[PDB]
Design a protein around this nucleic acid. Sequence first.
DNA 1: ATTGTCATGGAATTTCGCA
DNA 2: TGCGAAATTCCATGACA
DNA 3: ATTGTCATGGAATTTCGCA
DNA 4: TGCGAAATTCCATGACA
Lengths: 184, 184, 368, 368
Amino acid sequence: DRPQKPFDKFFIDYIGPLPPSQGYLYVLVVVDGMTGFTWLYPTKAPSTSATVKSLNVLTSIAIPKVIHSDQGAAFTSSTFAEWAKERGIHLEFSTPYHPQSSGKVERKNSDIKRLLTKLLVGRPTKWYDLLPVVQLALNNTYSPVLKYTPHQLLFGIDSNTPFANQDTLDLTREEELSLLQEIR
Amino acid sequence: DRPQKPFDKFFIDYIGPLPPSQGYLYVLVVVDGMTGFTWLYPTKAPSTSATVKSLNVLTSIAIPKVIHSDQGAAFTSSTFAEWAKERGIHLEFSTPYHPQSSGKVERKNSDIKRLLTKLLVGRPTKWYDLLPVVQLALNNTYSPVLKYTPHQLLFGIDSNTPFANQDTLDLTREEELSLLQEIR
Amino acid sequence: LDAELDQLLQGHYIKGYPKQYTYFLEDGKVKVSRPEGVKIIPPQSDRQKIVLQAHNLAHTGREATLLKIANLYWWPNMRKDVVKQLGRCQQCLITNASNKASGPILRPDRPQKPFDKFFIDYIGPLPPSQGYLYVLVVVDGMTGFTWLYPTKAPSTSATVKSLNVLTSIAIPKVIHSDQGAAFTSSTFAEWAKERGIHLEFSTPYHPQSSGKVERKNSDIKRLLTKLLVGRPTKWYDLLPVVQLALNNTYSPVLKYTPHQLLFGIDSNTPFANQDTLDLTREEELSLLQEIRTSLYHPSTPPASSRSWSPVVGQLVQERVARPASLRPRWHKPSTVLKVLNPRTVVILDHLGNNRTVSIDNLKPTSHQ
Amino acid sequence: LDAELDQLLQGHYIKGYPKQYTYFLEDGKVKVSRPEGVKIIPPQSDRQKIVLQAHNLAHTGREATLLKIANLYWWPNMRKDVVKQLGRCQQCLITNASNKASGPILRPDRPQKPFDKFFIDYIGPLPPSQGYLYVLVVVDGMTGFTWLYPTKAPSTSATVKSLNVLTSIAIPKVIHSDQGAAFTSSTFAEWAKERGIHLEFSTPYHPQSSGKVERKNSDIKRLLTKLLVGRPTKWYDLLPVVQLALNNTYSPVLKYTPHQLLFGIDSNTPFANQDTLDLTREEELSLLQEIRTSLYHPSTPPASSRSWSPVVGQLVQERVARPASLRPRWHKPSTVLKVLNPRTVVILDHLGNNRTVSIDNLKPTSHQ
DNA sequence: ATTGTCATGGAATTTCGCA
DNA sequence: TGCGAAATTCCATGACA
DNA sequence: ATTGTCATGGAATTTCGCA
DNA sequence: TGCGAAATTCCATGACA
Ligand SMILES: CN1C(=O)c2c3c(c(O)c(=O)n2[C@]12CC[C@@H]1C[C@@]12CO)C(=O)N(Cc1ccc(F)c(Cl)c1)CC3
Ligand SMILES: CN1C(=O)c2c3c(c(O)c(=O)n2[C@]12CC[C@@H]1C[C@@]12CO)C(=O)N(Cc1ccc(F)c(Cl)c1)CC3
Ligand SMILES: [Mg+2]
Ligand SMILES: [Mg+2]
Ligand SMILES: [Mg+2]
Ligand SMILES: [Mg+2]
Ligand SMILES: [Mg+2]
Ligand SMILES: [Mg+2]
Ligand SMILES: [Zn+2]
Ligand SMILES: [Zn+2]
């Protein structure tokens, strides 16, 4: 068997609904399986059209051999099946109620949901403008298992934005109280 | 003494008033003394301003060393004297009531007045448009004394409009009757 | 061609396939282990589609289309098939630029006598000056002697009015001009016929053909510019000054001024030459006839490293005159009917019209 | 100088006047019988006025001004006086064209790594497509990998919006652009400072400085043109197609595509290269690091026969950016303060402003 | 305080296939 | 150890308005 | 069914002045 | 029969938008 490579598999999923930011309510998360590189796209809905509009931007940079997702309506639609067939992309689904990705990807999706939660607290309506900084942080995060960050594995160079200050990611007692205040 | 050359002396004079043609009533006649070449300019008056406007066109092609004229008001004015001084042109006048030019020039001015009279008869109001053909005829007229036409002496080449058909210049009994009809 | 690839798998030689290579079958397709790597040998019946698919990704030329194909396949003389597709792609033929320069320019013979040929052209629009916007420039081909006329438009009516004043002096055999509306009108043709003047027209969109007058336009504008420094652009009153100044300016290569070439004697202008003072007009005209014949004439320059000269039957493409945004710069191929000279040609487009064009406005169609 | 000409008439030698000639007096002026003919020798105190009168007839250069003077006069080293006047004539200096080409171009080193330097520029206005008229082109200097963004204007707001989407991937060290309003604004400078990006600007009116992106604009427009043949110019929907097509196109000289130089592996596109299939990502990245260092680099071409290279203290003239009708094409002389490189220079005009300019937009002032 | 670039297709040159 | 042909490399030409 | 041109000012080359 | 300097000639450069 041949070694794992970037663009072999993209893991896609939707995060949301989130508080509205610039009219957007969801985030489509795309993670390259090999490198752990993350692309984030704000959508107004978790629909096939929003998935196709966002993925048309990503697939103008790089096309994956396989797209992996759960059995969400947007990804199981015949329209999404047609879109993939057109680009020579194989669609791969996990069994309903049993979401399996990979250790590296499952861990990555945890960091994404937690980093979004941490930064939402205090400014839950300003996340649209923060998506580029969230992505840079995530892609310049050192991988304990691979010795390199997703940026290094994707481009084969060091970045101009190293994220040396490895922040908490865990909510402070102040952020926890401010978060429970919003849940009202 | 040095031989006679083109631009050594220009003989100028006014012909008119003539019947109005395109608002013009006079013709300023300029004849180069050496070659016998003729330039004709229609003017609305025999004034210094009309002389200066017309001669500014001629002196944009060639400047004479001397301009010869009679003692007509337009040529004796201090304005015309100033215009010549500015261009380094010497003004030369004939004695009042005693007009002397040269054999070649006197003969040329006779041809001009007679050719104009011949062509005026029948169309006395259409002479403005005929001035270019009158000039070509005059300048392509063979000189019995010099063996060459004014065009040949000026350019040192044959013309593309030779005037082989040496016309009468004398008025026919029909043109004489049509001319005496106009004098009413 | 599956029958062609059948004998190959067996092991017997086929013209074009090197016998020193191992031709096997894997995943239901014919493969070959090549130095570069293992490549699929597609049946002859599939190749055209492959070349077209690779080419169409970005409408790439020879090498860029080949490099894509070579990533997956191998077959005998791949570039022969790439070039066959490049030569059939209408989008590439009409959009790509040429990479072959035109042949060296011709230096047409100087007209033998003054008035043999006039070169006429318009300068403008210029800043308004007394309601005038254009300048009609008339350059005598032999002498270079120029006449300037201010106009309100580059029209036939204004050209006719100006030339009737000029032709009072002498009538030219030929009047050469570009294909501007003022000169191609039936009224202008009629005006010339009436006078026995032959109208000669430059090939379309080639001002070099009118080079004699174009070059004078440069000198006229240069002097007007100098005289108007730190002053309002009131050029109207300067036209007579510019005309006289330029007509009396020495050409350093000829060592004569246009006035001297036309009359053989300077008029009463500053710094008039006095060298023929003791000669008679006849002796002076004899010397002028000698000067006019011995003037320097330039010869065609060397051809560039990669120039092209037209050939009857050759597929050639005319340049689009005013190409719109995101539209091809070239017309569809045409054929060369007659080669008038190495720089002028008669072409027949796909419409069926005969066009006399300059080779500067043509490219030879690529890939034969 | 009448005292200088006095000793001459007598017969004693004066430095500059050949003793083998006959210097006489006639019509109240000093004359000399020369091979060319009899010429007037004007007193030194009159010469400047003579040269200026001859020059001013048509603002002629060296030989054409000399030929006029020589018709009437003779004096020692006439051209020395002609050239002294030519060098003082402001109208000639600012209106005449240069006859010295710029020195050979520099081939700046290719940025070492992707994201070291981006080249940005705008294409447009294009025919309207979904309300969009412009395209922001972002070219990575090392790889050539391009990002395309449709905009309604070449504005800072549209550039900032586009670059915030792009910089989600990676942040560049430098962004090189021309001096267009969109990029020179304080809002853009502020946007870059916030991110640690250094803004580098081309010299004014020199698109060759932005050559990396300019050249990609050609390829973008060429492909858009091809894809829109015989169809309405609906380019908006084609931008993503053009981006992907060009980023995956082989450069025949490099034998790599911009995608391959950026990632070292082809994504799922047609004709993907499979040569590193058995290598690990680390082995693949090691080979990519080697490929990136061994790319072909062009060297400065030979200087032309008559080129000029700048020198500190040299009198030089900047080209007028948008010269109006009948107005000079050159600014008044300036001095070269610093020679940044043989093609870039710092000048001080007559105003007193320091300008960093390209030598292509300068001419060396004539006659010292 | 910066700087030209590179796709294109004939021609020139090198390599390949075979002996 | 060398031939003819195919493959690769060279590089002028031209356009980014 | 016609076609490039030529002013310009440094450099290259020829001529001049004197011996 | 040759030297140094002046004069003349050469010719690339660029613009006629
Ligand atoms: C369509 N067109 C032009 O674009 C044009 C030009 C010029 C005209 O005289 C002229 O008449 N026209 C017209 C307009 C009127 C008539 C239809 C036309 C005929 O082609 C012109 O002089 N220039 C300047 C120029 C550029 C480069 C050069 F090599 C030279 Cl020699 C000159 C070039 C553009
Ligand atoms: C005044 N100006 C231009 O004229 C211009 C150009 C171009 C720009 O991009 C551009 O921004 N500008 C602006 C407008 C906006 C901003 C002020 C400007 C900055 O100079 C441009 O690409 N072209 C095309 C071109 C011609 C020749 C070449 F050698 C190259 Cl490499 C490219 C040449 C004209
Ligand atoms: Mg889920
Ligand atoms: Mg009288
Ligand atoms: Mg024209
Ligand atoms: Mg023109
Ligand atoms: Mg720009
Ligand atoms: Mg540009
Ligand atoms: Zn194509
Ligand atoms: Zn001047």
